[PDB]
Design a protein around this ligand. Structure first.
Ligand SMILES: Nc1nc2c(ncn2[C@@H]2O[C@H](COP(=O)(O)OP(=O)(O)OP(=O)(O)O)[C@@H](O)[C@H]2O)c(=O)[nH]1
Ligand SMILES: Nc1ncnc2c1ncn2[C@@H]1O[C@H](COP(=O)(O)OP(=O)(O)O)[C@@H](O)[C@H]1O
Ligand SMILES: Nc1ncnc2c1ncn2[C@@H]1O[C@H](COP(=O)(O)OP(=O)(O)O)[C@@H](O)[C@H]1O
Ligand SMILES: Nc1ncnc2c1ncn2[C@@H]1O[C@H](COP(=O)(O)OP(=O)(O)O)[C@@H](O)[C@H]1O
Ligand SMILES: Nc1ncnc2c1ncn2[C@@H]1O[C@H](COP(=O)(O)OP(=O)(O)O)[C@@H](O)[C@H]1O
Ligand SMILES: [Mg+2]
Ligand SMILES: [Mg+2]
Lengths: 50, 51, 538, 412, 520, 154, 103, 77
């Protein structure tokens, strides 16, 4: 009845598509913005650096 | 056949152990010869003292 | 269910597991289909280098060719296990499981359950066991009919080898089996009957020797070759030097102690040789006419061989465990292992002892015994595969004829057993049986599967298999009403029926019993299995 | 005495035996056809230890190669070194032990052992001086381990005294993928100790280290390993086939290297793994040259025995011993055996074999795997099915408690 | 980077979803391996053998799953096999359903995985109560009912056709091992196999069965009253413990050293002949010389016999394990041996030891199996372990629970009725316990080919009104009461099934995350 | 259409194992395989026969005109040709004379059998034909004998 | 007992074809697998729903709580999901809201 | 005999060709017979491009799915 020896299961998303649940991703997104924020932290002020 | 090793407790055996051999081998060989033999076919390696 | 669990695996279920067991069965059946019967084809097996070994036995084909399928390895163990204890019926088990699966698979496609089908095979098997009691015939062993044993021997030998080898090798088995029967009626095959290889003139020159033949002879030239009356002596003591449990140096001091000590070392051997000389002094009378021979199970030192050569005592060393368990049966003496307690009663008797040599090897022959309780079968051959072909033929022939003397019954063959079960299962009233429901086809499936074996004999001869059973069916229709109990056969020479009672075709009792029992168990277990898978750590 | 038979069993056994004969035949001189093209008496006058002079001088080695996998025997035979061994000697029977002590052993001892006892008998009857038997088995496999155990036992019965030397190859924890290796290696030693008289431990894991460190072959092939095993074997056998008196003949080896009976296991040591006697001194005793996984410095040497070759005097070696004893005292033990002939290829080598308490590490390991990783009664049904019970396993672990104890008792 | 982790952390709800799907997948492999019409399973191990069976335990031994949640489900079969020996597939198939029914709630109604555990212990406490009430006692000495009790498990196997012989085979074996509380153990039950022969002539015989023959040919192959004496030691001179090294000075010493080797074996043999035994069974090997004078008294020598086979001989013949031969007396000699005889089979020789049959130590025995092939022997041997396992529970516990799913269905009805009166937050997991207990009859109807919709509806209608012993006939697929059907199973197997299945769910439900590839 | 099913149920045996039945002219090929080395033997039969350089694995060379000696070194693949090797080896061990007669006669019996099998004669009758010819052949060799030695030393 | 016979219908349809029929367990495989994407539209439902960022292969980023728009860009290999994908698109091209309710 | 003409050729004759013809027909039968009648099952022809299509007719199932076996090509035609 079957076409061959075995039949591997289908991944729902495409192979290599990154996905994650829970509170870890939104913390990573916030930490990503804070990482960009730290570059512009000492630039603020009339006594900042280029 | 089982661990043939010399044993000499005193100097009296040290003096006689070297010539004892000559004498013994010589005796066996003379025995062989009084029979008038002039050639012996050996089966394995022959020692120098017997030669 | 298995792919998310195991990242790598293979799984067949509910249609492929059934097709695999049937396809592998039909595949393995086609291999051994042509070998079954007297006019079957030979089969050689050359493995790595090109070692050649020739035989028609299905066990040799199965236990030499590596097989990957999971179904066939169970057929290999089933065909091997049935033959390893019985010695006959190897391909018959493969044909039954090879045919009963395909004959039931057509009804699995129709939608019948495997459980109730195998229930029909089991209750049908019990009917065959009840039929064996009525189908067999009693035979009294007190008559000692040698013609009856000759016909049984030709049943298996005609299947393996041709008529030229069968006629010369048949009485070799009959003379060996004629001595098996005794007052105790205890059968002994492995210790009594043996096989030995010897490259000689041809396979046709195989002869029977009533005594025990040995594969060794006298090492020294001066030792006697032929001895008229040789009284044997069994001694399991080893006469070369014995090393001695941690004992170490002969610490010698002067040079003389050395000679003395070597002489000493021997004294242990001469202490045992003196007991043999003391034994020879008791039997010293008629020394030129009579003789003496010593057979040792372990090696003898070459220094001590000159002692036996001077007294004209024949020396034989490094005998087998089995030969020491056979000298008492041939020569009639008793065994001994030590040299302290000796007597003239334990010494055997032999009427003729001679040696013959070819090339580097030398054989010792013993024969002309007074009352030999055992014997040997020295088979001659040309090539190594010729010995292997005679090995399987003699191994399967001795076991088949030996089982007839175990019991008081014998089953006629040539399809009489299978054709008789066909009419019995197809004509028996079902109300007497306890099976009901969808067990109608299970009786017909197993009853019809037995018919394929006797026509497989016809498939090797080339005749039409369906047409040569027409007169066989017509004979049994009139035989029941004619009031004459006769059993038909299948003669492949002319393509017509025959009678195995007068032709001499016979078969053992436990072969067909164990074959259907082993085949029904394997075929039933393969039908109920509905899933195959492989998993494990490696 | 004059001769010694050489049984080789198992896929590892056959490979190592083929390499060993390839070495031996070229050592004292015989083309693979058996003809002797050698120069002269020295190489011929002790050729009767392992070859049967046939009429016409077609020497043929006295070896019994056996395996339950037709294939390994076949490969070796169809290869070169296929004229020497007599065709009748090979004993090979289907199916495969299946890498199980229990199954392979019982089932085919039931058959292959009978055929082997038959071959060991008549072919050997042919000599006048059996001295013992040399078996090369793999401790961890199926056929080799099981059959070895059975045969050792069977032979010992048919040849009481005859010495019994083995060269079992211990398993590699890392490179032995099969999981049921320790659980076989344990059942094999159970019976190796009760019967054997002298045995040598070779570990594939150790062989890999020496192959990749000194030889520097990028990937060891079983071939390399086999060549190194072959070299040590050749040195120990020269200790035997060259006229000599220092450890002359097998039994002597045993007496010299075995302090007490239940300690058979030796640590081979060989150099110049790819020269002056002082140079080879360091190479023999370097902790990295051992072919045993356990470190010998942490352990304790009991009886040392060094087998030199090539051009070396009495005093070169004696002075060396005097110098060495002085510095490794914490680790008087010495036994020298100079030979005259030289390694094929190299001028001078020096094989090293010392009993050492350090083996108890290689057994504490194996016992740890056997017990801990089979407290869970894993992979045991394979063995209970063959017929042997679990009481036997309890006996097996018990007897290693014993081995370890012994080594600990001889105060490491 | 950071520590060896964080490849792909399956966290949150999807981690538990994979475990319920993985736990359900284990039961789906052996879904068809339940009931009287169960299908067989041939598994291929990587070494080279083959395992033909339908028992869930033997199937799950050979399989290998690279998932940590499914391996905990794999170990439950060892809990059932090494506790009773029957109902291993029942344990695996029930738990799958319990984890599956509880899942809806975990996934959707958000009940935390601890509140489900508290609901299950009260269901476990009530499950033992109704299983205790539904079970009826039975007399242990009734051989007529004991044969029908033993063959309840055999009916789900291949040898139901030979059930008339297997119950007699198993009943005689269990009473032999049974000690007069009533503790028995299967380590002395010898599982020796003989390939070939018919099952009808196969029978149990009191005593042992060796694979070896006598050494010397003159040994008596037929003894009327054997007198067995067990030996542990080598009967041959042995090297000895300390560093020895005899040094020989005179020529009359080496022949003396070889002569005392003959006299020491004479001394140990002569003291064995003080009691004059007929059969001497040595553990280790034997010499060719000692055997020779063992012969000069009338003994019989054998090859090396492993320890196991001697501890059974010690209980059969009544002898003791003896190593020191100097302390050999007449009291420790085995006696009351029935018969000695050696049959010829092409595989190997076989020495038979029969008992006179006429408290003391428990007697051992060996069960003869005459199958068709090698796999048929291993198939039948596991049936005896499953059949003889049933005989232990009735002796340890005289209670007897109804079979055919009637016991588990009784748990389903009472938990369903009591779930209404259990108003609160525990009501939803408590009611879901009945949904899985009604599946173990559903699997029987699916294998029988009937429609489980109307059968289970007809079952619950008659279970409350008709009786507590109602069940499904697996062969015919109709509702037939267990009283008239005449098939019963022990109550101990029902306890281990409910306990092990619920206790497995409490472990796996607490799993939050899965992190693979940390270290060895 | 693009590819066959490549012999299904072939996993019963290993991939390296091959069967060779009588059909497909394979018995004719086995006769042709004998014909390869049989023609080598023709040039080596008699007083004008030519020797053969049979170098071997080692390099050890032997130049020869004997059928039994030359066939020892050649590694043969065909099993039916190895029957002639061991048949001539039996001739050399027992009598030590007439090995070329064994090779050239038994090869030609397979040559004329190529015509008989092609005509349609069953293999069972072919063995019965040569056996009945063999009994008459060995009988007449004793009849047409002339001369005798009658003296061990002359 | 090492290599299987390899399903002798392998002479039929090529290795790329995979059959996932029933009885084998297709329904159990499907209803479940799609529970992952069922939670996607469930979490994005309601006024307090969470929008989902979908980055296509070209790189055009879209962030939406609108389910439809989502499944248009998701390259889904599972065929049984795709029945739900374009069935939701029918609601988009026609009714225009509820894309998330129908899924 | 065919290998002497073309070494790269193959041939199954008189027992292997018959099993191929019957097994390919039974293999084609076992897959495609389920669509017969009103209670038949639906097939999803999912090609590499992701095109989904439901049908029960044997013509379009065999047209999209290329046939490797030579026997079933004759039945598809
Ligand atoms: N040192 C060494 N070990 C080897 C070599 N080849 C194989 N082995 C060892 O062989 C072991 C497994 O092989 P065996 O147990 O001999 O295999 P076998 O059981 O004889 O093979 P079967 O009888 O077919 O099962 C492994 O532990 C390897 O370490 C080699 O060339 N050198
Ligand atoms: N000359 C013959 N005439 C008729 N039947 C024969 C003859 N030789 C063998 N048979 C039948 O062939 C069958 C198989 O014989 P045998 O080779 O002994 O067993 P197996 O083929 O199982 O090894 C037997 O049932 C026997 O009746
Ligand atoms: N003849 C039968 N009819 C209906 N149900 C049965 C029958 N025999 C056994 N069962 C059911 O099958 C379950 C398992 O029984 P059994 O097969 O003996 O154990 P295992 O699952 O270990 O093989 C039992 O719980 C019982 O309810
Ligand atoms: N000079 C000769 N004249 C005629 N015939 C010869 C002569 N020499 C040999 N023959 C024949 O050639 C045949 C060759 O026999 P052959 O098989 O080569 O003998 P061998 O067994 O020694 O090789 C002989 O039988 C002989 O009759
Ligand atoms: N302030 C509010 N109070 C109560 N319900 C609300 C409120 N705002 C939105 N909702 C509910 O949220 C739901 C969101 O439905 P939605 O999925 O957007 O509809 P559709 O599926 O038709 O696009 C609506 O059915 C609506 O009733
Ligand atoms: Mg037969
Ligand atoms: Mg059960």
């Amino acid at each position: 009845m079957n076409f061959g020896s075995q039949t591997p299961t289908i991944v729902v998303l495409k192979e290599g598509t990154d996905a994650s649940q829970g509170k870890g991703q939104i913390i990573s997104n916030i930490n990503a913005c804070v990482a960009v924020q730290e570059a512009l932290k000492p630039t603020l002020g009339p006594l900042g650096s280029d | 056949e089982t661990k043939g090793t010399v044993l000499l407790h005193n100097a009296q055996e040290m003096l006689d152990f070297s010539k004892g051999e000559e004498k013994q081998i010589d005796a066996m060989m003379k025995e062989i010869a009084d029979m008038g033999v002039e050639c012996i076919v050996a089966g394995a390696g022959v020692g120098e003292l017997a030669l | 269910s298995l792919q998310l669990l195991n990242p790598k695996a293979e799984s067949l279920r509910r249609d492929a597991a059934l097709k695999v067991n049937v396809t592998s069965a039909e595949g393995l059946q086609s291999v051994l289909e042509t070998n079954l019967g007297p006019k079957g084809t030979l089969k050689m097996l050359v493995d790595g280098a090109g070692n050649i070994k020739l035989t028609k036995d299905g066990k040799v084909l199965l236990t030499e060719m590596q097989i990957q399928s999971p179904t066939a390895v169970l057929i290999a163990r089933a065909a091997a296990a049935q033959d390893e204890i019985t010695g006959d019926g190897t391909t018959t088990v493969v044909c039954l499981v090879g045919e009963l699966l395909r004959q039931a698979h057509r009804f699995i496609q129709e939608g019948v359950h495997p459980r109730i089908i195998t229930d029909g095979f089991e209750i049908a098997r019990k009917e065959s066991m009840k039929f064996l009691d009525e189908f067999k015939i009693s035979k009294t062993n007190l008559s000692n009919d040698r013609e009856f044993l000759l016909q049984v021997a030709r049943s298996s030998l005609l299947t393996k080898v041709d008529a030229d080898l069968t006629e010369v090798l048949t009485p070799i088995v009959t003379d060996a089996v004629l001595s098996v029967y005794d007052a105790q009626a205890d059968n002994l095959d492995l210790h009594m009957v043996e096989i030995m290889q010897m490259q000689h003139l041809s396979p046709k020159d195989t002869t029977f020797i009533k005594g025990l033949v040995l594969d060794h002879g006298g090492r020294h030239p001066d030792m006697p070759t032929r001895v008229k009356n040789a009284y044997v002596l069994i001694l399991n003591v080893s006469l070369e030097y014995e090393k001695t449990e941690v004992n170490s140096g002969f610490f010698y001091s002067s040079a003389d102690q050395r000679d003395k000590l070597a002489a000493s070392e021997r004294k242990f051997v001469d202490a045992k040789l003196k007991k043999i000389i003391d034994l020879k002094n008791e039997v010293c009378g008629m020394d030129p006419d009579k003789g003496f021979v010593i057979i040792n199970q372990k090696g003898i030192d070459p220094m001590s061989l000159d002692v036996f050569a001077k007294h004209n005592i024949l020396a034989l060393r490094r005998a087998k465990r089995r030969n020491m368990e056979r000298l008492q049966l041939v020569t009639g003496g008793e065994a001994q292992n030590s040299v302290e307690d000796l007597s003239p009663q334990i010494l055997g008797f032999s009427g003729l002892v001679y040696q013959e040599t070819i090339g580097e090897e030398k054989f010792t022959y013993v024969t002309e015994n007074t009352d030999p309780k055992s014997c040997t079968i020295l088979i001659k051959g040309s090539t190594h595969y010729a010995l292997a072909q005679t090995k399987d033929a003699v191994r399967d022939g001795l076991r088949a004829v030996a089982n007839v003397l175990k019991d008081k019954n014998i089953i006629p063959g040539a399809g009489a057993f299978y054709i008789a079960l066909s009419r019995y299962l197809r004509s028996a009233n079902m109300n007497k049986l306890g099976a009901k429901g969808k067990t109608k086809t299970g009786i017909e499936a197993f009853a019809e599967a037995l018919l394929v074996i006797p026509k497989t004999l016809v498939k090797n001869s080339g005749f039409d298999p369906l047409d040569v059973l027409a007169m066989v069916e017509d004979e049994l229709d009139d035989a029941q009403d004619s009031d004459e109990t006769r059993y038909v056969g299948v003669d492949l020479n002319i393509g017509d029926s025959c009678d195995p009672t007068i032709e001499g075709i016979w078969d053992s009792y436990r072969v067909l019993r164990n074959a259907i029992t082993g085949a029904t168990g394997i075929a039933s277990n393969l039908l109920l299995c509905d899933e195959l898978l492989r998993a494990g750590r490696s | 005495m004059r001769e010694i038979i050489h049984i080789s069993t198992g896929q590892c056994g056959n490979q190592i035996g083929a390499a060993f004969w390839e070495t031996i035949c070229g050592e004292h001189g015989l083309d693979f056809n058996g003809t002797y093209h050698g120069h002269d008496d020295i190489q011929k006058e002790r050729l009767n230890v392992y070859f049967n002079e046939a009429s016409s001088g077609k020497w043929v080695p006295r070896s019994i190669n056996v395996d339950l996998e037709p294939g390994t025997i076949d490969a070796v035979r169809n290869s070169a070194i296929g004229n020497l061994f007599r065709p009748d000697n090979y004993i090979f029977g289907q199916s495969s032990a299946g890498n199980v002590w229990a199954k392979g052993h019982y089932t085919e001892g039931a058959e292959l052992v009978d055929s082997v006892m038959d071959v060991i008998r008549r072919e050997a009857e042919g000599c006048d001086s059996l001295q013992g038997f040399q078996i090369t088995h793999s401790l961890g496999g199926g056929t080799g381990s099981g059959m070895g155990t059975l045969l050792i036992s069977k032979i010992r019965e048919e040849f009481p005294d005859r010495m019994m030397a083995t060269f079992s190859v211990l398993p590699s924890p890392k490179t032995s993928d099969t999981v049921v290796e320790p659980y076989n290696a344990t059942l094999s030693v159970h019976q190796l100790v009760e019967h054997s008289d002298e045995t040598f431990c070779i570990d594939n894991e150790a062989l890999y280290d020496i192959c990749q460190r000194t030889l520097k072959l990028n990937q060891p092939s079983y071939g390399d390993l086999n060549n190194l095993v072959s070299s040590v074997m050749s040195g120990v056998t020269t200790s035997l086939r060259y006229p000599g008196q220092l450890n002359s003949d097998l039994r002597k080896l045993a007496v010299n290297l075995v302090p007490f009976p239940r300690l058979h296991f030796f640590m081979v040591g060989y150099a110049p793994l790819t020269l002056t006697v002082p140079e080879l001194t360091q190479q023999m005793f370097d902790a990295k040259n051992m072919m045993a996984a356990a470190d010998p410095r942490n352990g304790r040497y009991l009886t040392v025995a060094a087998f030199f070759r090539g051009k070396v005097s009495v005093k070169e070696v004696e002075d060396e011993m005097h110098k060495v004893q002085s510095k490794n005292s914490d680790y008087n033990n010495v036994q020298t055996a100079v030979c005259s002939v030289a390694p094929q290829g190299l001028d001078m080598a020096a094989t090293f074999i010392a009993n050492s308490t350090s083996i108890q590490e290689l057994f504490k390991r194996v016992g740890d795997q056997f017990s801990a990783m089979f407290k869970r009664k894993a992979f045991l049904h394979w063995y209970t099915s063959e017929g042997m019970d679990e009481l036997e396993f309890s006996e097996a672990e018990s007897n290693m408690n014993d081995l370890v104890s012994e080594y600990q008792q001889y105060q490491e | 980077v950071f520590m060896n982790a964080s490849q792909e952390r399956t966290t949150g709800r999807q981690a538990q979803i994979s475990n319920i799907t993985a736990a359900k997948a284990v039961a789906d492999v052996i879904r068809t391996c339940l009931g009287p019409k169960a299908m067989l399973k041939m598994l291929l191990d990587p070494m080279g053998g083959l395992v033909l069976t339908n028992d869930g335990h033997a199937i799950l031994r050979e399989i290998d799953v690279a998932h940590p949640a499914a391996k905990s489900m794999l170990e439950l079969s060892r809990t059932q096999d090494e506790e009773v020996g029957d109902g291993t597939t029942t344990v695996i198939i029930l738990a799958g359903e319990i984890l599956a029914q509880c899942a809806p709630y975990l996934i959707e109604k958000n009940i935390h995985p601890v509140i489900i555990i508290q609901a299950l212990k009260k269901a476990l406490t009530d499950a033992l109560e109704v299983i205790k009430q539904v079970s009826k006692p039975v007399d242990v000495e009734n051989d007529a009912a004991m044969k029908k009790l033993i063959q309840a498990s055999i009916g789900t196997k291949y040898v139901i056709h030979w059930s008339e012989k297997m119950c007699e085979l198993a009943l005689d074996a269990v009473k032999t091992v049974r000690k007069d509380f009533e503790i028995d153990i299967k380590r002395y039950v010898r599982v020796e196999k003989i390939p070939g022969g018919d099952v009808l002539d196969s029978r149990v015989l009191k005593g042992v069965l060796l694979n070896k023959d006598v050494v010397h040919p003159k040994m008596s192959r037929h003894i009327e009253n054997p007198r067995v004496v067990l030996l542990d030691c080598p009967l041959e001179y042995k090297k000895g413990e300390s560093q020895t090294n005899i040094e020989i000075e005179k020529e009359e010493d080496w022949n003396r050293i070889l002569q005392i080797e003959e006299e020491q074996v004479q001394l140990m043999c002569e003291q064995i002949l003080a009691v004059r035994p007929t059969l001497v069974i040595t553990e280790k090997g034997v010499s060719d010389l000692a055997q020779h004078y063992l012969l000069k008294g009338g003994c019989s020598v054998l090859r090396r016999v492993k320890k196991s086979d001697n501890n059974r001989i010690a209980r059969v013949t009544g002898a003791t394990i003896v190593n020191r031969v100097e302390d050999l007396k007449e009291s420790d000699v085995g006696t009351n041996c029935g018969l000695f005889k050696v049959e010829m089979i092409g595989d190997e020789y076989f020495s038979f030891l029969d008992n006179c049959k006429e408290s003391g130590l428990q007697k051992a025995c060996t069960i003869m199996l005459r199958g068709g092939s090698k796999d048929i022997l291993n198939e039948i041997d596991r049936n005896l372990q499953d059949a003889m396992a049933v005989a232990r529970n009735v002796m340890l516990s005289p209670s007897l629970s109804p079979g055919g799913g009637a016991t588990e269905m009784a748990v389903s009805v009472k938990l369903a009725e009591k779930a209404k009166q259990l108003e609160g937050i525990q009501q939803w997991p408590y009611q879901a316990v009945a949904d899985a207990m009604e599946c173990i009859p559903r699997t029987l109807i699916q294998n029988a080919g009937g429609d489980p919709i109307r059968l289970l509806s007809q079952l619950r209608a008659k279970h409350a009104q008709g009786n507590f012993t109602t069940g499904i006939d697996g062969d015919k697929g109709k509702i037939v009461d267990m009283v008239s059907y005449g098939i019963w199973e022990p109550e101990v197997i029902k306890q281990q099934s409910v306990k092990t299945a619920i206790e497995s769910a409490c472990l796996l439900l607490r799993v939050d995350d899965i992190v693979s590839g940390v270290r060895k | 259409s693009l590819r066959l099913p490549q012999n299904p149920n072939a996993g019963l045996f290993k991939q390296g194992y091959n069967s060779y039945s009588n059909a497909d002219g394979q018995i004719i090929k086995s006769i042709a395989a004998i014909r390869e080395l049989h023609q080598m033997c023709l040039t080596s039969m008699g007083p004008c026969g030519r020797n053969k350089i049979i170098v071997n694995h080692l390099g050890k060379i032997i130049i020869t005109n004997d059928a039994a000696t030359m066939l020892r070194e050649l590694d043969i693949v065909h099993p039916a040709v190895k029957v002639l090797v061991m048949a001539t080896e039996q001739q050399k061990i027992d009598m030590g004379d007439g090995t070329n007669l064994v090779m050239i006669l038994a090869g030609e019996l397979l040559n004329v059998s190529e015509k008989l099998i092609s005509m349609g004669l069953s293999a069972v009758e072919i063995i019965q034909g040569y056996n009945m010819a063999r009994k008459f052949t060995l009988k007449e060799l004793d009849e047409m004998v002339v001369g005798e030695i009658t003296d061990k030393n002359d």
